[PDB]
């Protein structure tokens, strides 16, 4: 075969502005709706926090600095908060084509963090196979803007949703949907508009007889006066001639909460979520199969993204702080699970009791999420870690 | 890139006519006004300008000063000569000096271009009332002003 | 790679207040947040809400490999966690105070404080919407510039950076030190709530109640002047009226009724309570307004979980500075302990049911060690290690003794 | 049906294109070996799963279980290859 | 001030050994209480406030003969006398090192 791709890309970094970096900005800072829905997104992929695996990793144990550690042990002190750092990065990278950072160290030149940057600011400048070669950066200053190119041999960059497997540089989920969060934000402006004039009755004073003796701004500024709502308490009455008619505007119905449900089964749908998560609720939907199929298909898509998260977050930032600042191999087997954000503990219980006799006391132990045993064989048996205590004091 | 070099132009321009705008308001409708009548123009006008603001019950904290006020002000005697000063910064760093901004109970100094006043000259502009300098009868070289008014 | 960072960020070239908002943040802002917390009402009590969820059931600090760290502090042992505790009396009242303001303000922030003696007092929380932090132009914070009301005006001074410490719940970025007020983001969506709860309370007074109108003479027949009404008002009076009078008139008097004009003033309350809640990221539960279908099944559950994943959220992002930026400098500065060490602070789940984990308990403590177990129950671990890091109960293993 | 007849015509194309041709051009084994690549079931519930273990399990050896119950096969072949539970075997290993 | 009329920061002073003669007679300098210092009553050239005066990062001193007063053989000449003796001669640059 080939050790260059000799297939096209379709594409030339020399496709977004940083106009169109700093509208997602303004879509996320503003709040509101659908603020709070694509935050939502982004804590049910990565608010649930995160464990760091290596296969074999008993094997790497090697003094690091008067002590021991596992390579899993050193990544843990390596990224001590991975949780917050995993919903930033994990974040952003929802909002925007991709989350960004910088590798830093100490003053004397061992790690320190993996750094985000802030990704509004940056767009990657790529070649014709695709691949990012330089960040052009421009941030807000004093009278202006200051403006920057850096290499990409230095930072890092993280991209969960992409046009092709090929695309390096990934798709903003606001960006692709910008039709229908302007399509939901003009109907919710045109509710609270509609509410104002139309969801309250008004008094309308009609004064004169019909084909009578017309009044004048100036006899209603009188008239005004009587009939001041601002002046009137609640069981006010009113005595009139037969030529003074109070008439209402009556609040004229229409269904803004059937308008309502309908931008939120746009939107909601538009970014993948259920409609549930809008506080929208639908018939038959919240029970049985119905119910199953959609709970499958969100988890699903959070599979999807923690996956591909985890892959890119390991190979850009994990690989290259184990080659540069540690003693320990980085071609190992590391792996950066990031977990389920509706895992049930109660049927987790449940199968535990039906199948325990199938499974060793470190699988039970990592399903139950607890630390496995601390002697290898009771730790690797099957009969469970208390059955074997009561039998090692019987026997 | 001529698209920086143009958002770089673009931005400083606005940036010179918000400071445009701001100098002509500042210079024209101040209310207070210490006449030197070409003498004791450095130290003793601008305590003497504090002074006029005082009499008025407010409280000055900063001063905009035009390139001949600058000149001036470090030519006198008494920021010029360490001894009179207390240090020897003015005569050494000049308008980065420490003392100038902080002189005469004002904690800022916010030093002007002698184009920022609208002369009324560049098209499109419609000057201001006065005459921003320090050269000749009538010039306004400097403002005393309160910051937050 | 390098030491200090290299990309840029959107500070106002360093000075200023910079804030997510593209400007600066004022003291008029700080006070208007004070004015929204202060005045009561609805949206006051659902910010405590959210505050209460987030911070309200304790916390609990744990070291690791505390039983390692035995020290004598004043000629007799403690462990880090010991000292902590000792350190720290009344965390669970700082956490919700601290957790609180830094859910209404864009920070909570605070001082040392010291003994006249010179060992460590207190962590002493500062007022937030007195203080102010100025960024410099990689964002960092250098000093912190304050102001109060004081007799009649205000006074003012700066601090260093140096010696204060600040929590940033809400940021702009991963880089914002000066953080976000949930507040003034959403300042918009609270004002139109509050406008429509005085729209609908106002619409109420002038529509919700019926309306007696007396009309007085025969149409197209002898005019009525208003000192004639004037009497025809006594008569009518409601002030006056009862349940049962009842009246007498000629044919030339109409008693009408402006009626009760029906409008749906609950589905307003419902829709602008919708709009508060979610926009402050409570659940719509939190404003005493319910829909249907999503009070049961996958529909419940998922609502649920995404208040306990925004709960969780907040709660290690407050952890980690507070562990980081209080207690390591207390531990430094005036412990004989390792700040080093591997602090953790928690603070509790407040939507936990005790019973689901008895349940649990029950099905699958046969592989849990009793201090796992202790753990989970919110219990003191057994006194002695080996009954506590044993599987089968302390209860086992007592009556197994007592058959020897 | 739909996902299977679909995850069973993708399977058979990627051994057949992609897997085996690298094996066979890359790797020192047989290529014509019987290689399966199988995709997992999204709609598979484990507690209908746990509940046939359970009903049916005397007739599954401990790998078929293992397999079934999406589980790492017992490192030990005979216990494998058996039918009654591992911890079954393990107490009366222990009875001894 | 000229310079900074014009909206330049000049950081640079260029000399004439006149101008230098005349610089350190000046009585600013002169007097160890106007200057900060007794340095350039000491040391004339090699005094640090000659190198940081009026905002000025650095002093160059000339010699009389560099300039072309077109004398030399094939040196055409500048239009200026640099000096500092008499009605218009030239006697120092204060400058942008940078431009
Ligand atoms: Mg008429
Ligand atoms: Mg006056
Ligand atoms: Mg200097
Ligand atoms: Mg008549
Ligand atoms: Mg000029
Ligand atoms: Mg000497």
Same mark, same amino acid.
């Given at each position: 075969?080939?050790? $260059?791709?000799?297939?096209?890309?379709?594409?030339?970094?020399?496709?977004? $502005?940083?106009?169109?970096?700093?509208?997602?900005?303004?879509?996320?800072?503003?709040?509101?709706?659908?603020?709070?829905?694509?935050?939502?997104?982004?804590?049910?992929?990565?608010?649930?926090?995160?464990?760091?695996?290596?296969?074999?990793?008993?094997?790497?144990?090697?003094?690091?600095?008067?002590?021991?550690?596992?390579?899993?042990?050193?990544?843990?002190?390596?990224?001590?908060? +991975?949780?917050?750092?995993? +919903?930033?990065?994990? !974040?952003?990278?929802?909002?925007?084509?991709?989350?960004?950072?910088?590798?830093?160290?100490?003053? =004397?030149?061992?790690?320190?963090?993996?750094?985000?940057?802030?990704?509004?600011?940056?767009?990657?400048?790529?070649?014709?196979?695709?691949?990012?070669?330089?960040?052009?950066?421009?941030?807000? =200053?004093?009278?202006?803007?200051?403006?920057?190119?850096?290499?990409?041999?230095?930072?890092?960059?993280?991209?969960?949703?992409?046009?092709?497997?090929?695309?390096?540089?990934?798709? %903003?989920?606001?960006?692709?949907?910008?039709?229908?969060?302007?399509?939901?934000?003009?109907?919710?402006?045109?509710?609270?508009?509609?509410?104002?004039?139309?969801?309250?009755?008004?008094?309308?004073?009609?004064? #004169?007889?019909?084909? !009578?003796?017309?009044? &004048?701004?100036?006899?209603? *500024?009188?008239?005004?006066?009587?009939?001041?709502?601002?002046?009137?308490?609640?069981?006010?009455? /009113?005595?009139?001639?037969?030529?003074?008619?109070?008439?209402?505007?009556?609040?004229?119905?229409?269904?803004?909460?059937?308008?309502?449900?309908?931008?939120? *089964?746009?939107?909601?749908?538009?970014?993948?979520?259920? +409609?549930?998560?809008?506080? @929208?609720?639908?018939?038959?939907?919240?029970?049985?199969?119905?119910?199953?199929? &959609?709970?499958?298909?969100?988890? +699903?898509?959070?599979?999807?993204?923690?996956? %591909?998260?985890?892959?890119?977050?390991?190979? &850009?930032?994990?690989?290259?702080?184990?080659?540069?600042?540690?003693?320990?191999?980085?071609?190992?087997?590391? *792996?950066?699970?990031?977990?389920?954000?509706?895992?049930?503990?109660?049927?987790?219980?449940?199968?535990?009791?039906? @199948? #325990?006799?199938?499974?060793?006391?470190?699988?039970?132990?990592?399903?139950?999420?607890?630390?496995?045993?601390?002697?290898?064989?009771?730790?690797?048996?099957?009969?469970?870690?208390?059955?074997?205590?009561?039998?090692?004091?019987?026997? | 890139?001529?698209?920086?070099?143009?958002?770089?132009?673009?931005?400083?321009?606005?940036?010179?006519?918000?400071? &445009?705008?701001?100098? =002509?308001?500042? @210079?024209?409708?101040?209310?207070?006004?210490?006449? =030197?009548? #070409?003498?004791?123009?450095? /130290?003793?006008?601008?305590?003497?300008?504090?002074?006029?603001?005082?009499?008025?019950?407010?409280?000055?904290?900063?001063? @905009?000063?035009?390139?001949?006020?600058?000149?001036?002000?470090?030519?006198? $005697?008494?920021?010029?000569?360490?001894?009179?000063?207390?240090?020897?910064?003015?005569?050494?760093?000049?308008?980065?000096?420490?003392?100038?901004?902080?002189?005469?109970?004002?904690?800022?100094?916010?030093?002007? %271009?002698?184009?920022?006043?609208?002369?009324?000259?560049?098209?499109?502009?419609? #000057?201001?009332?006065?005459?921003? !300098?320090?050269?000749?009868?009538?010039?306004?070289?400097?403002?005393?002003?309160? *910051?937050?008014?």
């Amino acid at each position: 075969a080939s050790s $260059t791709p000799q297939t096209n890309v379709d594409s030339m970094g020399g496709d977004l $502005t940083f106009e169109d970096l700093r509208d997602i900005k303004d879509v996320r800072d503003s709040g509101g709706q659908v603020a709070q829905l694509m935050d939502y997104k982004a804590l049910l992929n990565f608010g649930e926090g995160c464990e760091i695996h290596v296969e074999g990793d008993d094997e790497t144990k090697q003094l690091v600095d008067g002590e021991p550690m596992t390579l899993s042990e050193w990544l843990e002190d390596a990224f001590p908060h +991975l949780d917050l750092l995993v +919903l930033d990065l994990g !974040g952003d990278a929802l909002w925007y084509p991709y989350a960004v950072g910088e590798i830093q160290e100490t003053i =004397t030149g061992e790690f320190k963090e993996a750094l985000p940057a802030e990704p509004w600011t940056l767009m990657p400048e790529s070649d014709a196979q695709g691949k990012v070669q330089a960040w052009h950066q421009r941030t807000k =200053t004093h009278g202006g803007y200051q403006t920057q190119t850096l290499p990409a041999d230095d930072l890092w960059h993280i991209v969960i949703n992409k046009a092709s497997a090929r695309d390096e540089v990934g798709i %903003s989920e606001v960006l692709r949907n910008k039709d229908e969060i302007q399509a939901f934000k003009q109907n919710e402006a045109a509710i609270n508009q509609a509410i104002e004039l139309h969801g309250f009755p008004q008094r309308h004073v009609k004064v #004169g007889k019909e084909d !009578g003796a017309p009044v &004048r701004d100036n006899d209603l *500024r009188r008239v005004r006066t009587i009939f001041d709502p601002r002046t009137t308490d609640a069981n006010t009455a /009113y005595f009139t001639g037969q030529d003074v008619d109070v008439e209402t505007l009556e609040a004229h119905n229409f269904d803004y909460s059937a308008i309502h449900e309908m931008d939120m *089964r746009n939107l909601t749908t538009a970014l993948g979520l259920p +409609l549930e998560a809008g506080n @929208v609720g639908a018939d038959g939907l919240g029970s049985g199969k119905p119910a199953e199929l &959609r709970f499958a298909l969100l988890k +699903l898509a959070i599979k999807a993204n923690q996956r %591909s998260f985890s892959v890119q977050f390991v190979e &850009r930032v994990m690989r290259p702080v184990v080659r540069d600042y540690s003693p320990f191999d980085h071609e190992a087997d590391i *792996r950066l699970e990031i977990n389920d954000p509706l895992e049930d503990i109660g049927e987790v219980a449940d199968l535990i009791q039906q @199948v #325990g006799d199938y499974m060793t006391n470190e699988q039970v132990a990592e399903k139950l999420d607890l630390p496995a045993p601390e002697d290898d064989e009771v730790a690797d048996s099957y009969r469970s870690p208390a059955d074997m205590e009561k039998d090692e004091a019987g026997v | 890139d001529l698209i920086e070099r143009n958002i770089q132009r673009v931005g400083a321009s606005l940036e010179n006519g918000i400071n &445009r705008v701001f100098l =002509t308001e500042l @210079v024209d409708n101040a209310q207070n006004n210490h006449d =030197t009548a #070409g003498s004791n123009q450095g /130290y003793q006008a601008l305590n003497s300008a504090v002074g006029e603001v005082d009499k008025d019950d407010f409280r000055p904290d900063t001063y @905009v000063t035009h390139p001949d006020y600058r000149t001036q002000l470090f030519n006198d $005697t008494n920021l010029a000569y360490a001894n009179r000063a207390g240090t020897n910064e003015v005569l050494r760093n000049r308008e980065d000096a420490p003392i100038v901004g902080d002189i005469a109970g004002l904690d800022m100094h916010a030093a002007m %271009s002698s184009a920022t006043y609208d002369d009324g000259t560049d098209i499109g502009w419609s #000057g201001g009332s006065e005459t921003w !300098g320090f050269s000749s009868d009538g010039d306004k070289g400097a403002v005393v002003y309160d *910051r937050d008014n």
